[PDB]
Amino acid sequence: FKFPRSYAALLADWPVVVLGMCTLLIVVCALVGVLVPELPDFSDPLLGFEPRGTTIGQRLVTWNNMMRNTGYKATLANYPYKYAEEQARSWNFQKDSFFCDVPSDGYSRVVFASAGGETLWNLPAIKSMCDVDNSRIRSHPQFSDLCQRTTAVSCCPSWTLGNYIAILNNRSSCQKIVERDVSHTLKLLRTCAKHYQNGTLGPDCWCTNVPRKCTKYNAVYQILHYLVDKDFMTPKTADYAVPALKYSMLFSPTEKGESMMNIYLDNFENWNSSDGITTVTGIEFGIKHSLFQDYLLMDTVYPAIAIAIVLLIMCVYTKSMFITLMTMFAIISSLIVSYFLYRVVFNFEFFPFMNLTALIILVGIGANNAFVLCDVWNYTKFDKPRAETSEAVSVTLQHAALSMFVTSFTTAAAFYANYVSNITAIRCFGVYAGTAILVNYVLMVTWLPAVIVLHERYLLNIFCWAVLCQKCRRVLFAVSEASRIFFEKVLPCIVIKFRYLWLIWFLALTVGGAYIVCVNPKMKLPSLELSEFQVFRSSHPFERYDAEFKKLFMFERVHHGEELHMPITVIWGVSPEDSGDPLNPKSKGELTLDSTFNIASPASQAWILHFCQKLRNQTFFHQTEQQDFTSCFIETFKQWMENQDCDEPALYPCCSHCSFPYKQEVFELCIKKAIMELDRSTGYHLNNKTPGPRFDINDTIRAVVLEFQSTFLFTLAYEKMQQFYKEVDSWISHELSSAPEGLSRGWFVSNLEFYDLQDSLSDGTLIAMGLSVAVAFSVMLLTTWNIIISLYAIVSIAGTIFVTVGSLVLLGWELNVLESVTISVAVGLSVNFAVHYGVAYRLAPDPDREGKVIFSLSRMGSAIAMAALTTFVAGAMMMPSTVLAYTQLGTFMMLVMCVSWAFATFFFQCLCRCLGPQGTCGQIPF
Ligand SMILES: CC(C)CCC[C@@H](C)[C@H]1CC[C@H]2[C@@H]3CC=C4C[C@@H](OC(=O)CCC(=O)O)CC[C@]4(C)[C@H]3CC[C@]12C
Ligand SMILES: CC(C)CCC[C@@H](C)[C@H]1CC[C@H]2[C@@H]3CC=C4C[C@@H](OC(=O)CCC(=O)O)CC[C@]4(C)[C@H]3CC[C@]12C
Ligand SMILES: CC(C)CCC[C@@H](C)[C@H]1CC[C@H]2[C@@H]3CC=C4C[C@@H](OC(=O)CCC(=O)O)CC[C@]4(C)[C@H]3CC[C@]12C
Ligand SMILES: CC(C)CCC[C@@H](C)[C@H]1CC[C@H]2[C@@H]3CC=C4C[C@@H](OC(=O)CCC(=O)O)CC[C@]4(C)[C@H]3CC[C@]12C
Ligand SMILES: CC(C)CCC[C@@H](C)[C@H]1CC[C@H]2[C@@H]3CC=C4C[C@@H](OC(=O)CCC(=O)O)CC[C@]4(C)[C@H]3CC[C@]12C
Ligand SMILES: CC(C)CCC[C@@H](C)[C@H]1CC[C@H]2[C@@H]3CC=C4C[C@@H](OC(=O)CCC(=O)O)CC[C@]4(C)[C@H]3CC[C@]12C
Ligand SMILES: CC(C)CCC[C@@H](C)[C@H]1CC[C@H]2[C@@H]3CC=C4C[C@@H](OC(=O)CCC(=O)O)CC[C@]4(C)[C@H]3CC[C@]12C
Ligand SMILES: CC(C)CCC[C@@H](C)[C@H]1CC[C@H]2[C@@H]3CC=C4C[C@@H](OC(=O)CCC(=O)O)CC[C@]4(C)[C@H]3CC[C@]12C
Ligand SMILES: CC(C)CCC[C@@H](C)[C@H]1CC[C@H]2[C@@H]3CC=C4C[C@@H](OC(=O)CCC(=O)O)CC[C@]4(C)[C@H]3CC[C@]12C
Ligand SMILES: CC(C)CCC[C@@H](C)[C@H]1CC[C@H]2[C@@H]3CC=C4C[C@@H](OC(=O)CCC(=O)O)CC[C@]4(C)[C@H]3CC[C@]12C
Ligand SMILES: CC(C)CCC[C@@H](C)[C@H]1CC[C@H]2[C@@H]3CC=C4C[C@@H](OC(=O)CCC(=O)O)CC[C@]4(C)[C@H]3CC[C@]12C
Ligand SMILES: CC(C)CCC[C@@H](C)[C@H]1CC[C@H]2[C@@H]3CC=C4C[C@@H](OC(=O)CCC(=O)O)CC[C@]4(C)[C@H]3CC[C@]12C
Ligand SMILES: CC(C)CCC[C@@H](C)[C@H]1CC[C@H]2[C@@H]3CC=C4C[C@@H](OC(=O)CCC(=O)O)CC[C@]4(C)[C@H]3CC[C@]12C
Numbered sequence: 071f072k073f074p075r076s077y078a079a080l081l082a083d084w085p086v087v088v089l090g091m092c093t094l095l096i097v098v099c100a101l102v103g104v105l106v107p108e109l110p111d112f113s114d115p116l117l118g119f120e121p122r123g124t125t126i127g128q129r130l131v132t133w134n135n136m137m138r139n140t141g142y143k144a145t146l147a148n149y150p151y152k153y154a155e156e157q158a159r160s161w162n163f164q165k166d167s168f169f170c171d172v173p174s175d176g177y178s179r180v181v182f183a184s185a186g187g188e189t190l191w192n193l194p195a196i197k198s199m200c201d202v203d204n205s206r207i208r209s210h211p212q213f214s215d216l217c218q219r220t221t222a223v224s225c226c227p228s229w230t231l232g233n234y235i236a237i238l239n240n241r242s243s244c245q246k247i248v249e250r251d252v253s254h255t256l257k258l259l260r261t262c263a264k265h266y267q268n269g270t271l272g273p274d275c276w277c278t279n280v281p282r283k284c285t286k287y288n289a290v291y292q293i294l295h296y297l298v299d300k301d302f303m304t305p306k307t308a309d310y311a312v313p314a315l316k317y318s319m320l321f322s323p324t325e326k327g328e329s330m331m332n333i334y335l336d337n338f339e340n341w342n343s344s345d346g347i348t349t350v351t352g353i354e355f356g357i358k359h360s361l362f363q364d365y366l367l368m369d370t371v372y373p374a375i376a377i378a379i380v381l382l383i384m385c386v387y388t389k390s391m392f393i394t395l396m397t398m399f400a401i402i403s404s405l406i407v408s409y410f411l412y413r414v415v416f417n418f419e420f421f422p423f424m425n426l427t428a429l430i431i432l433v434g435i436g437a438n439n440a441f442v443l444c445d446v447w448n449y450t451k452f453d454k455p456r457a458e459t460s461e462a463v464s465v466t467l468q469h470a471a472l473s474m475f476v477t478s479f480t481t482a483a484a485f486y487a488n489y490v491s492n493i494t495a496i497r498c499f500g501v502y503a504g505t506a507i508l509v510n511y512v513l514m515v516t517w518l519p520a521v522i523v524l525h526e527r528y529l530l531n532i533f534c535w536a537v538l539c540q541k542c543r544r545v546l547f548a549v550s551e552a553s554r555i556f557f558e559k560v561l562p563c564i565v566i567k568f569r570y571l572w573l574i575w576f577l578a579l580t581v582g583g584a585y586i587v588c589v590n591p592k593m594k595l596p597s598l599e600l601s602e603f604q605v606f607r608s609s610h611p612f613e614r615y616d617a618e619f620k621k622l623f624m625f626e627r628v629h630h631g632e633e634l635h636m637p638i639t640v641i642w643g644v645s646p647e648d649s650g651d652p653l654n655p656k657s658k659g660e661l662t663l664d665s666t667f668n669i670a671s672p673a674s675q676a677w678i679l680h681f682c683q684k685l686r687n688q689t690f691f692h693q694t695e696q697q698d699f700t701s702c703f704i705e706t707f708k709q710w711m712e713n714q715d716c717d718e719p720a721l722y723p724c725c726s727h728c729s730f731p732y733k734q735e736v737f738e739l740c741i742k743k744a745i746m747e748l749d750r751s752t753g754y755h756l757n758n759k760t761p762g763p764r765f766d767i768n769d770t771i772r773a774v775v776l777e778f779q780s781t782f783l784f785t786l787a788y789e790k791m792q793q794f795y796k797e798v799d800s801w802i803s804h805e806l807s808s809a810p811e812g813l814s815r816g817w818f819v820s821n822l823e824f825y826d827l828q829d830s831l832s833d834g835t836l837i838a839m840g841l842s843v844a845v846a847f848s849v850m851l852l853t854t855w856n857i858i859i860s861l862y863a864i865v866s867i868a869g870t871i872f873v874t875v876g877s878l879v880l881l882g883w884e885l886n887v888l889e890s891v892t893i894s895v896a897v898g899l900s901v902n903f904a905v906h907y908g909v910a911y912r913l914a915p916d917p918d919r920e921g922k923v924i925f926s927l928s929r930m931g932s933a934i935a936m937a938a939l940t941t942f943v944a945g946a947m948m949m950p951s952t953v954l955a956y957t958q959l960g961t962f963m964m965l966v967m968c969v970s971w972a973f974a975t976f977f978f979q980c981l982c983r984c985l986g987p988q989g990t991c992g993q994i995p996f
């Protein structure tokens with residue numbers, strides 16, 4: 071084909087070649103990306119929330135692998151199974167005055183409130199609950215088969231006040247009851263409220279120290295413990311004029327689980343939840359996460375509206391459909407090419423649901439690039455209106471391709487910085503967004519200028535409804551002038567005239583941000599446990615169950631408030647190595663057994679026994695009065711040997727006669743005898759959790775695990791949990807340094823999964839900050855070449871972070887997973903506005919501060935404002951969503967927009983006006 075002597079001439083001369091080449095290369099990526107890599111799945115929205123490389127993580131996955139692999143013939147067995155061959159060679163309640171069970175979690179249940187009225191205790195509300203149960207749940211066909219029935223005729227009653235009250239007044243059903251029953255039951259509860267709080271009127275009855283009449287169907291306990299707000303009856307029960315019920319819970323005689331999915335979708339999901347007298351306000355059918363997949367897809371409309379509005383804006387700004395359509399096509403196609411790269415070339419086997427949320431980011435920064443290019447192109451068409459097309463292209467690129475790089479590169483580098491995190495979902499998201507930004511940048515340099523050539527080559531030729539078009543052209547020209555004089559005079563006037571106000575005002579706002587984030591109420595690590603994470607909008611009937619009602623109903627409030635000790639576990643022979651893929655959350659290593667290990671050497675037998683007793687002196691050991699003969703198994707073996715009198719040839723190696731550091735071989739024999747005996751000397755059977763030795767397929771000892779209870783208690787609170795971990799690990803890790811060989815390389819673990827996420831979120835955040843700020847500062851130097859300007863730019867950027875993070879703290883964000891990503895992103899999104907003002911301030915020909923800033927503002931203000939405004943409106947478009955991440959990104963985009971725009975237009979322009987380098991002293995040579 072024909073040859074042009076320059077790239078800017080290839081654009082001018084054969085732009086169609088560029089478009090053909092690019093559309094080909096999009097479409098082959100679309101094809102391979104659809105065909106070859108398996109489709110992403112969000113049926114588990116938590117899937118990659120897992121720190122990997124962390125020492126606690128490697129220990130945990132190793133331990134988890136041991137539990138998984140332990141079992142009969144398989145590797146790392148729990149008994150000496152080869153030796154275990156040798157031992158073989160050697161409805162109407164006034165009849166139906168009972169419930170099919172006492173309810174619990176594991177049943178499907180709902181929580182009622184009322185839209186008005188101060189107590190649910192009134193008869194109409196009671197009847198409303200049993201009515202709406204019938205009308206929403208029992209009315210469904212499938213329920214009749216889901217039921218924990220006793221007969222087909224009427225399968226089983228639910229648990230609700232409406233049923234207990236009936237039995238307690240010998241009525242047939244909820245529909246028969248009267249306010250005499252309600253008052254009589256209220257008298258029962260007001261009498262029996264005191265007994266229940268003590269626990270004297272306990273769960274099992276029909277208790278013993280309490281009047282039998284209070285507890286005849288065992289009912290009172292169940293009512294107060296399951297059905298009713300813990301605040302309904304209290305020590306103030308009689309101090310209340312009448313007790314007030316804010317909430318009640320109702321239990322279906324059907325499972326909490328996937329089986330409910332139809333009934334929810336059928337009868338709950340899009341009802342107004344109400345009869346006014348009552349409202350369902352919490353629901354737990356268990357389907358919370360399994361519904362997510364479907365919900366995410368319903369919400370993608372909001373992203374689609376965001377794109378449709380970003381189109382409209384770019385049309386109005388560019389005065390063409392065509393440039394706006396082909397830019398939008400480029401923006402979209404970059405997600406396809408990057409998706410191809412991410413699955414195929416980079417060979418990542420997993421794609422977090424979060425990556426879809428990067429679309430709404432990338433359309434914002436896509437429009438940002440489109441603005442500065444079309445703007446500078448139009449500057450060339452004004453600065454040099456008569457030009458040859460390739461020359462005009464060249465000078466446009468000489469200007470724009472640099473600035474449009476550093477918008478993009480700083481933002482990509484902020485997303486790739488999240489690859490430093492130990493968390494797989496974050497590392498993946500940080501890479502996908504990073505590539506899609508850079509792919510989009512390449513299209514904005516190759517594809518887009520070719521379209522600008524086509525626009526001048528052809529598209530100007532094409533030209534009541536007959537005049538309303540002209541009305542609009544007139545009016546939009548009027549705003550083009552009003553906006554022009556606003557930027558070219560008014561905004562500079564505002565900034566200079568009140569410079570001193572703007573400086574202290576924004577400065578105080580940053581201190582507010584810094585105080586809020588860093589001291590009070592300090593930015594907090596997540597403290598709902600992972601298996602209960604929020605995924606829907608906080609108003610949503612599922613989220614209110616985990617968020618509010620688990621605090622309020624006694625069985626929940628107690629069961630999740632109960633004390634459990636940390637099972638301090640210590641392990642040897644298995645190495646603490648994770649050999650899985652550090653990005654694919656489906657992958658894990660197997661075991662890796664260590665040839666240096668043994669226990670049968672008498673030196674080991676001595677040291678390990680001694681070590682348990684040393685482990686028994688440490689302050690953190692909870693010395694139970696109950697004795698676990700599997701904790702420190704070797705003691706149990708020692709005393710068993712000592713109990714073993716000898717009167718047979720077979721028992722000579724296992725004689726009590728021998729000194730405790732036994733010969734390795736007789737240890738290796740007698741240990742098998744002792745443990746295989748445990749099926750007979752006790753009824754207890756081992757399982758994969760059970761402490762003790764562990765076996766080869768041919769029952770050499772390959773490993774051993776010991777376990778002990780802490781003084782400490784299980785908690786989600788990072789500080790207390792950290793105190794526990796650091797103490798116990800430090801002591802064990804020190805003490806192991808004393809051990810004879812092979813025991814030299816043990817390690818410790820216990821129920822620490824949620825702690826390791828918290829500890830990995832803070833470090834993963836902070837380091838991705840330090841990295842993203844460092845790169846953002848380097849770009850600031852490399853563009854402005856003036857250390858003074860860069861210092862101010864960095865101060866303003868830092869200020870935006872403190873105000874955004876501070877306001878997100880006040881909005882009540884934990885440092886949970888998505889949120890902890892966004893904080894790095896904020897650095898990338900913030901920096902580019904300060905870069906634009908920075909370069910324009912140097913490029914000002916004016917000799918003085920005021921001239922320099924006036925030039926910078928008048929030159930950039932429109933394009934900056936569009937970048938902010940488009941991103942902001944795209945963000946706002948996510949607000950109506952139902953999925954939390956969509957709304958969470960939404961708030962964040964709006965907020966970081968205003969804040970970064972405000973600091974970049976005001977504060978940064980004070981520091982230039984009020985302190986800017988007008989002498990050359992801040993400048994550095996190439
Ligand atoms: C993502 C995909 C759908 C993008 C596909 C790009 C097309 C819409 C572009 C590529 C080349 C363009 C064409 C290049 C040349 C011409 C010839 C031109 O015809 C004339 O009458 C003038 C001919 C001349 O003197 O050059 C009108 C515009 C048109 C059809 C252009 C219309 C838009 C086209 C087909
Ligand atoms: C809620 C939204 C969807 C309604 C309002 C949006 C309009 C004000 C936008 C949408 C597309 C835009 C148009 C895209 C392309 C052109 C071609 C161009 O046509 C000409 O004949 C040149 C006239 C001139 O510039 O003087 C003039 C601008 C115009 C009408 C744009 C003006 C502003 C428009 C009508
Ligand atoms: C970066 C963006 C622009 C692209 C990201 C990849 C998408 C092309 C993937 C992500 C999730 C996928 C969806 C996940 C689930 C479903 C339900 C599925 O429903 C069925 O009836 C088939 C069920 C099955 O066999 O899996 C149809 C495909 C679809 C929409 C998938 C189509 C391809 C999707 C949209
Ligand atoms: C990873 C790959 C696929 C990206 C490829 C993109 C390039 C083809 C783009 C990026 C920036 C563009 C450049 C932006 C600015 C200029 C400067 C301009 O002027 C000079 O080079 C003057 C040199 C002199 O001083 O003599 C000529 C076009 C050129 C190189 C552009 C040509 C096309 C470039 C190299
Ligand atoms: C893997 C991909 C994403 C990397 C792509 C990087 C390039 C697009 C960068 C690297 C070096 C940059 C170039 C370094 C130096 C120059 C010379 C510069 O020449 C000028 O005339 C400067 C003075 C002036 O603007 O008047 C114009 C921009 C240009 C080509 C830069 C444009 C953007 C470039 C090609
Ligand atoms: C907008 C335009 C300029 C396209 C974007 C350019 C690049 C960002 C992409 C597009 C297709 C990619 C290529 C697709 C296929 C291959 C084959 C691949 O071959 C190997 O032997 C891979 C071995 C392996 O690592 O497994 C090497 C990378 C390469 C050239 C890729 C490098 C990056 C490319 C050039
Ligand atoms: C609920 C949703 C559907 C509401 C959508 C409202 C938008 C259509 C409004 C909100 C803000 C408006 C914008 C406010 C500021 C500007 C900048 C203004 O810029 C200039 O006039 C530049 C003139 C030039 O230099 O050529 C053009 C109109 C525009 C994009 C406005 C067009 C109409 C916008 C996008
Ligand atoms: C480089 C400067 C000039 C600009 C600002 C960037 C960072 C220094 C800021 C942004 C977000 C802040 C972080 C937000 C959240 C946390 C988690 C927080 O973790 C805790 O365990 C707090 C106590 C608890 O949760 O009980 C410790 C501080 C830290 C890293 C903050 C410290 C200061 C950070 C890293
Ligand atoms: C993904 C990798 C390739 C990124 C590497 C870091 C980039 C941010 C660096 C690499 C080369 C640098 C460029 C090398 C040379 C120059 C020329 C230098 O002087 C001029 O051209 C003056 C232009 C003007 O007056 O603004 C301006 C900075 C610039 C574009 C540098 C900007 C920052 C660049 C693109
Ligand atoms: C006042 C001027 C300066 C304009 C400010 C921006 C507005 C154009 C838009 C953008 C985002 C919008 C808000 C986005 C979300 C909501 C939440 C919505 O309320 C709820 O979701 C909470 C209901 C509850 O639980 O009480 C009420 C409208 C509101 C405040 C919107 C009101 C109009 C806002 C501020
Ligand atoms: C002018 C520019 C800035 C764009 C304006 C976008 C608006 C069209 C958005 C911003 C806030 C949105 C509102 C934010 C919150 C809600 C509550 C939401 O309440 C529900 O019942 C659904 C959620 C639930 O199930 O709890 C219904 C949509 C609505 C009114 C949204 C409708 C669309 C609004 C007004
Ligand atoms: C002149 C304008 C364009 C500049 C100032 C912009 C503000 C009006 C924006 C920036 C951030 C926005 C907020 C970002 C996040 C939220 C949370 C959102 O949800 C709730 O507040 C739910 C909980 C509650 O109701 O307390 C409601 C909208 C709100 C306050 C937004 C309202 C509009 C705000 C304050
Ligand atoms: C969403 C966040 C990131 C803020 C984005 C920047 C806005 C604050 C800018 C963009 C366009 C600006 C507007 C452009 C033009 C005008 C007309 C201007 O009109 C006059 O001064 C009066 C003229 C007369 O005499 O009739 C008043 C300010 C206003 C609304 C500007 C107010 C500030 C705006 C909305």
Ligand SMILES: CC(C)CCC[C@@H](C)[C@H]1CC[C@H]2[C@@H]3CC=C4C[C@@H](OC(=O)CCC(=O)O)CC[C@]4(C)[C@H]3CC[C@]12C
Pocket residue numbers: 877880881965968969972
């Ligand atoms: C353009 C300039 C002025 C900077 C950007 C606008 C800020 C001043 C906005 C952006 C987000 C706003 C915050 C968004 C959410 C909230 C939560 C809201 O509720 C609470 O703090 C309740 C406190 C309590 O219960 O006592 C009060 C307003 C506040 C702090 C807002 C205060 C004003 C903020 C920081």
Ligand SMILES: *[C@@H]1O[C@H](CO)[C@@H](O)[C@H](O)[C@H]1NC(C)=O
Pocket residue numbers: 164165240
């Ligand atoms: C309860 O109802 C039954 C009839 O269904 C009746 O025999 C009985 O006397 C009633 N009263 C009591 C206290 O059980």
Ligand SMILES: *[C@@H]1O[C@H](CO)[C@@H](O)[C@H](O)[C@H]1NC(C)=O
Pocket residue numbers: 185342344345346
């Ligand atoms: C909607 O909610 C109100 C709450 O008062 C309730 O009265 C009404 O019956 C519900 N359903 C319909 C169809 O209006």
Ligand SMILES: *[C@@H]1O[C@H](CO)[C@@H](O)[C@H](O)[C@H]1NC(C)=O
Pocket residue numbers: 680683684687
């Ligand atoms: C410390 O442990 C040894 C056995 O390891 C025991 O004899 C000694 O009494 C313990 N000391 C204290 C203070 O508990």
Ligand SMILES: *[C@@H]1O[C@H](CO)[C@@H](O)[C@H](O)[C@H]1NC(C)=O
Pocket residue numbers: 766767768
């Ligand atoms: C015993 O098991 C080990 C590892 O499982 C294996 O290498 C060895 O060959 C086995 N020996 C016999 C005799 O089964």
